[PDB]
Scaffold this active site. Structure first.
Site, PDB file in Angstrom:
ATOM      1  N   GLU A  62       0.820  -1.203   0.000  1.00 13.74           N
ATOM      2  CA  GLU A  62       0.000   0.000   0.000  1.00 13.74           C
ATOM      3  C   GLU A  62       0.858   1.258   0.000  1.00 13.74           C
ATOM      4  O   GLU A  62       1.943   1.303   0.585  1.00 13.74           O
ATOM      5  CB  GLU A  62      -0.945   0.010   1.209  1.00 13.74           C
ATOM      6  CG  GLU A  62      -1.911   1.173   1.198  1.00 13.74           C
ATOM      7  CD  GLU A  62      -2.839   1.198   0.015  1.00 13.74           C
ATOM      8  OE1 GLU A  62      -2.418   1.749  -1.033  1.00 13.74           O
ATOM      9  OE2 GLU A  62      -3.946   0.621   0.089  1.00 13.74           O
ATOM     10  N   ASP A  90      -2.003  -5.031   1.231  1.00 10.54           N
ATOM     11  CA  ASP A  90      -1.420  -3.878   1.911  1.00 10.54           C
ATOM     12  C   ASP A  90      -0.015  -4.132   2.424  1.00 10.54           C
ATOM     13  O   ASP A  90       0.841  -3.239   2.314  1.00 10.54           O
ATOM     14  CB  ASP A  90      -2.306  -3.423   3.083  1.00 10.54           C
ATOM     15  CG  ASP A  90      -3.672  -2.896   2.637  1.00 10.54           C
ATOM     16  OD1 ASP A  90      -3.761  -2.221   1.586  1.00 10.54           O
ATOM     17  OD2 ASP A  90      -4.671  -3.163   3.350  1.00 10.54           O
ATOM     18  N   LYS A 116     -14.544  -7.810   3.271  1.00  9.09           N
ATOM     19  CA  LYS A 116     -13.235  -8.047   2.675  1.00  9.09           C
ATOM     20  C   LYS A 116     -13.038  -9.514   2.347  1.00  9.09           C
ATOM     21  O   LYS A 116     -12.517  -9.848   1.282  1.00  9.09           O
ATOM     22  CB  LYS A 116     -12.120  -7.587   3.617  1.00  9.09           C
ATOM     23  CG  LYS A 116     -11.995  -6.063   3.821  1.00  9.09           C
ATOM     24  CD  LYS A 116     -11.465  -5.359   2.569  1.00  9.09           C
ATOM     25  CE  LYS A 116     -10.534  -4.227   2.913  1.00  9.09           C
ATOM     26  NZ  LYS A 116     -10.146  -3.541   1.656  1.00  9.09           N
TER      27      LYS A 116
HETATM   28  C1  LIG Z   1      -5.863   1.356  -4.927  1.00  9.84           C
HETATM   29  O1  LIG Z   1      -5.935   0.114  -4.278  1.00  9.84           O
HETATM   30  N1  LIG Z   1      -6.933   0.146  -3.276  1.00  9.84           N
HETATM   31  C2  LIG Z   1      -6.684  -0.358  -1.932  1.00  9.84           C
HETATM   32  O2  LIG Z   1      -5.640  -0.813  -1.675  1.00  9.84           O
HETATM   33  C3  LIG Z   1      -7.770  -0.302  -0.844  1.00  9.84           C
HETATM   34  N2  LIG Z   1      -9.061   0.324  -1.200  1.00  9.84           N
HETATM   35  C4  LIG Z   1     -10.154   0.402  -0.189  1.00  9.84           C
HETATM   36 BR1  LIG Z   1     -11.855   1.211  -0.665  1.00  9.84          BR
HETATM   37  C5  LIG Z   1      -9.940  -0.164   1.217  1.00  9.84           C
HETATM   38  C6  LIG Z   1      -8.646  -0.788   1.569  1.00  9.84           C
HETATM   39  O3  LIG Z   1      -8.454  -1.236   2.659  1.00  9.84           O
HETATM   40  C7  LIG Z   1      -7.564  -0.867   0.569  1.00  9.84           C
HETATM   41  O4  LIG Z   1      -6.376  -1.479   0.986  1.00  9.84           O
HETATM   42 MN   LIG Z   2      -6.715  -2.255   2.904  1.00  7.56          MN
HETATM   43 MN   LIG Z   3      -4.794  -1.551  -0.222  1.00  6.02          MN
END
Ligand SMILES: CONC(=O)c1[nH]c(Br)cc(=O)c1O
Ligand SMILES: [Mn+2]
Ligand SMILES: [Mn+2]
Length: 180
Positions: A62, A90, A116
């Site tokens: 991330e 992440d 998730k």
């Molecule tokens: C660009 O990639 N997006 C992500 O990594 C992402 N998006 C969301 Br909504 C919630 C998360 O917890 C997360 O890790």
């Molecule tokens: Mn996340």
């Molecule tokens: Mn993410």
């Protein structure tokens, strides 16, 4: 808006810069999608707090641009053999040798967990959900970090929550499900 002002009040510059970048990757204005602005910042901070707490134990995926995020994913997969996740996670935990998906939610932890989990549908990525209420859920109730490090994330989340509520911004924020 006081929300953008608060985002730039409580989150150090590095994170806010990255958050605006990830907001342009959706044709999105952080001056309009300000609850997303804050959620993106809060999540980024959680990921960074988690990595630093664990000799580096976690690799931050991330906060990277997608080219380098998937490059780091691929390097890890090829030198350890972990299965390529369908979605960018992440962190990578070099100690348990798994990918971690950090969830930060304004809803109940069990709910965003099921969310998730049902989204990733690969029980090889560990999920750790944090609320703004000192609650956490986590795949097989394995929380990875030492208790202290988790104290620290939860305190930081509850601090953003109280700081938003002192500005009368928490009702809006909890009543939004973006950034999630
Ligand atoms: C660009 O990639 N997006 C992500 O990594 C992402 N998006 C969301 Br909504 C919630 C998360 O917890 C997360 O890790
Ligand atoms: Mn996340
Ligand atoms: Mn993410």
């Amino acid at each position: 808006s006081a929300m953008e002002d608060f985002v730039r009040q409580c989150f150090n510059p590095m994170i806010v810069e990255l958050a605006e970048k990830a907001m342009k990757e959706y044709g999105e204005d952080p001056k309009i999608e300000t609850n997303k602005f804050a959620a993106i910042c809060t999540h980024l901070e959680v990921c960074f707090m988690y990595s630093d707490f664990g000799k580096h134990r976690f690799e931050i995926i991330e906060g990277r641009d997608r080219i380098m995020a998937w490059t780091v994913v691929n390097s890890i997969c090829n030198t350890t053999g972990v299965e390529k996740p369908k979605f960018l996670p992440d962190l990578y935990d070099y100690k348990e040798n798994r990918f971690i998906e950090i969830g930060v939610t304004r809803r109940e932890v069990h709910i965003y967990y099921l969310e998730k989990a049902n989204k990733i549908k690969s029980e090889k990525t560990h999920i750790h959900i944090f609320s703004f209420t000192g609650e956490e859920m986590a795949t097989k109730a394995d929380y990875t970090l030492d208790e202290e490090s988790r104290a620290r994330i939860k305190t930081r989340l509850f601090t953003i929550r109280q700081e938003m509520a002192s500005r009368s911004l928490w009702d809006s924020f909890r009543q939004s499900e973006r950034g999630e």
